[PDB]
Design a protein around this ligand. Sequence first.
Ligand code: HEM
Ligand code: NA
Length: 153
Amino acid sequence: VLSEGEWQLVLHVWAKVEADVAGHGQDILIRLFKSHPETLEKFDRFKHLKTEAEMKASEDLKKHGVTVLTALGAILKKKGHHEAELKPLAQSHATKHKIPIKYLEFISEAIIHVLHSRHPGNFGADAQGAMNKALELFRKDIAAKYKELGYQG
Ligand code: HEM
Ligand code: NA
C-alpha cells in the first residue's frame, strides 16, 4: 500500500506527462519496442514498423500511446482503488492480446526511463521509488486478475 505522500509524488510527475501526453506516449512506446523488440510482435497493427523514424511518424502509434497513457493515468489517479479500471484491461490483455507480466515489467521500465529522462525536476530518487511502487501495485493487481481469468501471465 502506497502512502498519500507517495501518491502525490506519482501524481506530481503525471501532471507533467499531461502537458503533452501524445509526446510522452511516443517516447515510452518507442523505448519499449527498442529495448524489448519481442513486445512489438504483439501488435499486429504496428509490427511492420522497422525503425524509430517509422515509429515517430506513425499517427496511429501516437494515437495508441495517448490511449495507453490516459488509461494508466486514470488508474494512478485512483491511488490504488482501481478495481473497476483494471477489470476490462486485465481481460483484454490476458485473453485478447496475451501480454505476460514479464512484458508489463518491460513497459514499467520504459515509463520510468522516460520520466527519469524528461522530468529530473519531478523524478528524483524518492519520486522514482513512488512511481515504481505504484507500477508494482498495478502489476500485482493485474497478475491476480490474470489468474482469476485463467491466464498464467
Ligand atoms: C501500463 C500498461 C498498459 C496499459 C495501461 C495498456 C493500455 C491499453 C489500452 C487502454 C488498450 C486499448 C483497449 C484494450 O484493448 O484494452 C491497449 C491495447 C493493447 N495493448 Fe496494452 N496496455 C499496457 C501494457 C501492454 C503491453 C506491455 C503490451 C504488449 C507488450 C500491450 C499490448 C496491447 C495490444 C497488442 C493492444 C491492442 C492494440 C491494438 O489496437 O491493435 N499492452 N492497451
Ligand atoms: Na509541453
